[PDB]
Design a protein around this ligand. Sequence first.
Ligand SMILES: NS(=O)(=O)c1ccccc1OC(F)F
Length: 182
Amino acid sequence: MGPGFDFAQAIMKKNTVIARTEKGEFTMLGVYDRVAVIPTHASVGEIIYINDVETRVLDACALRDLTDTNLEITIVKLDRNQKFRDIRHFLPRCEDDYNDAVLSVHTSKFPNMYIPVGQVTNYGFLNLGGTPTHRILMYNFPTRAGQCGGVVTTTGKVIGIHVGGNGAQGFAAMLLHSYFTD
Ligand SMILES: NS(=O)(=O)c1ccccc1OC(F)F
């Protein structure tokens, strides 16, 4: 409808796949080469389904900060025959607050879904499903379970992936440029 949605759409059409694990279907953001991200609660194993194709997982790393606190991001390298468009230059370098963000989801249940979530707060610490978690972004929208993995963007930036909510607010894990230095 506007330049926010334009940037979100451009990311969804080229840099997302549908990931299926034993814990459900997730939006999954491809970042560069065969490297994607997913919430750690997806519990990635040795094999994952990518757009309904059986795919070997070459590596998977559940990120934690240097206090040894959960970040709720898993970086996955996929045994896929095709590379993602490199979007690392759209990643923020530092923790920040944002205006006017969009949360975008693409699954079987919610195809081509875009939500203007508005102002995003650097919330920091969250007890997420009982797990102390750092680098959480917060937005005032009543997100559901099916949004997990959803991409959070502003115009020109890919800032986070949706990892949970409390019925009134939604929560995303930060993406930082430093997570994807090769
Ligand atoms: N965003 S959501 O997942 O809660 C959802 C799903 C289907 C229809 C409407 C809807 O939004 C609700 F907030 F309006």
